[PDB]
């Protein structure tokens, strides 16, 4: 068959949102606390992550439907998915060659080593890199990649969610367009969709691992004082 | 007369503390969020101020007596005096020539203009600069300057203070050494002491002004999210 107007209107709506919240020049990175190669990277990455949360929020506010959800639900979804949207969006700059996140220039190229000095262990970094690679290999389309982020953020199976009905619908509406688009626009994507969901599944484990470690760091004020108000609030455990 | 051993032991104790918490190279400034000349300076100055709080604390922990006070009293004194210790210590880098704070190099030279873009108004900046100048003119000695900071931090007339007795004593013990030292070691300081106290008095007004403005900014999350955990905690109103 072929996508409909509605299905398409959504695709253009998401894609526009992403271009508007993801700067390809990375010119904002120069404004973060400088990277330093005892958690010497924590300041710079904290600022990177904080900055990213801001973008993920801006992206969400533009997803059709999300804005009509209750402020409470919006938060529930963000606080539980944000970390995953960041892992998904960071892939856009992940490079298989040097196995790293190459952003602005040389200063903003984060190796597996750099990332180590931010308070996280291989217990997370190993699977994370694994994830980035496997995903980078799916050579998804900008439309598929953008959808996947919207599907992950509109997962009703997140703690704190109230209207576990309306959201379930929205996600369903998104999941179709993806299955459709791939069927129609992505030659050789006969097995893509299924593969993309397995990725939304891996994101839960990463989410899990990061949360444990985040608590550990978060408890030591000499380390939490290095974070940002937004990072503390979103990754915090306040209800 | 002439200072005693005790009086002197304190002077060397304070002076050593200051040298240990005030880096003359300012090499740490490069690690702050870069300055940008809509509150473009807020990030860099927030980091400057946060960094300074850390130093003021380290300085306090080394003041003879302070460490024996109750953790509660230590906090009461810090939270209420910190902002003043920072205004006093910043004078060490204030330059009468260009009427600015010249720190590291050109990047870390803050004009009256720069400081405007951090969320503060002339309502505070005007008297502040006025203060810095009048004080810079007293050409105090490192021993007098260091004492003055210790006297200001050990002011018992601060909200939250419990042991309003023991502290009153410590401050008294400090105020003498200053009156003595000046009498003995500072030619032409016949009127200095009195002039220095008038400065501890001006610090209360500045403290006052800054607090009002800090609240204003602090209430707007788009601005508070730019601050640091330590700045929020110390300048916050938690009891």
């Amino acid at each position: 068959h072929m996508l409909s107007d509605e299905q398409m209107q959504i695709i253009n709506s998401l894609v526009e949102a992403h271009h508007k919240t993801y700067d390809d020049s990375y010119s904002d990175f120069v404004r973060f606390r400088p990277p330093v190669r005892r958690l010497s990277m924590l300041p710079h990455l904290a600022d990177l992550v904080s900055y990213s949360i801001q973008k993920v929020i801006g992206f969400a506010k533009m997803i059709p439907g999300f804005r009509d959800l209750t402020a409470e639900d919006q938060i529930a979804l963000l606080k539980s998915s944000a970390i995953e949207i960041i892992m998904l969006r960071s892939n856009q700059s992940f490079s298989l060659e040097d196995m790293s996140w190459s952003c602005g220039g040389p200063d903003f190229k984060y190796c597996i080593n750099d990332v180590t000095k931010a308070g996280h262990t291989l217990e997370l970094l190993e699977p994370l890199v694994k994830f980035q690679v496997g995903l980078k290999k799916l050579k998804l389309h900008e439309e598929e990649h953008v959808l996947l982020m919207a599907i992950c953020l509109l997962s009703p199976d997140r703690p704190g969610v109230q209207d576990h009905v309306r959201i379930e619908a929205l996600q369903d509406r998104l999941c179709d367009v993806l299955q459709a688009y791939i069927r129609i626009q992505h030659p050789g994507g006969r097995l893509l969709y299924a593969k993309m969901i397995q990725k939304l599944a891996d994101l839960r484990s990463l989410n899990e691992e990061h949360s444990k470690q985040y608590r550990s760091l978060s408890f030591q004020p000499e380390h939490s004082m290095q974070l940002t108000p937004l990072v503390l609030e979103v990754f915090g455990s306040e209800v | 007369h002439m200072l005693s051993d005790e009086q002197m032991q304190i002077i060397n104790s304070l002076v050593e503390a200051h040298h240990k918490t005030y880096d003359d190279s300012y090499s740490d400034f490069v690690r702050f969020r870069p300055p940008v000349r809509r509150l473009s300076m807020l990030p860099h100055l927030a980091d400057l101020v946060s960094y300074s709080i850390q130093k003021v604390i380290g300085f306090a922990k080394m003041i003879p007596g302070f460490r024996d006070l109750t953790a509660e009293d230590q906090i009461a004194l810090l939270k209420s005096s910190a902002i003043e210790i920072i205004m006093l210590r910043s004078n060490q880098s204030f330059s009468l020539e260009d009427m600015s704070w010249s720190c590291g190099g050109p990047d870390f030279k803050y004009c009256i203009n720069d400081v405007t873009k951090a969320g503060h108004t002339l309502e505070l900046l005007e008297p502040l600069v006025k203060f810095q100048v009048g004080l810079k003119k007293l050409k105090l000695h490192e021993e007098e300057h260091v004492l003055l900071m210790a006297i200001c931090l050990l002011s018992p007339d601060r909200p939250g203070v419990q042991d309003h007795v023991r502290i009153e004593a410590l401050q008294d013990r400090l105020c003498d050494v200053l009156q003595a030292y000046i009498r003995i070691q500072h030619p032409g300081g016949r009127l200095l002491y009195a002039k220095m106290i008038q400065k501890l008095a001006d610090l209360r007004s500045l403290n006052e002004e800054h607090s009002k403005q800090y609240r204003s900014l602090s209430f707007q999350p788009e601005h508070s999210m730019q601050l640091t955990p330590l700045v929020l905690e110390v300048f916050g109103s938690e009891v």
Binding site: Q54, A71, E233 | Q220, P221
Partner: peptide
């Protein structure tokens, strides 16, 4: 009660 998240979510 999530000061920042709320502010960023409106506008």
């Amino acid at each position: 009660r999530h000061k920042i998240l709320h502010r960023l979510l409106q506008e």
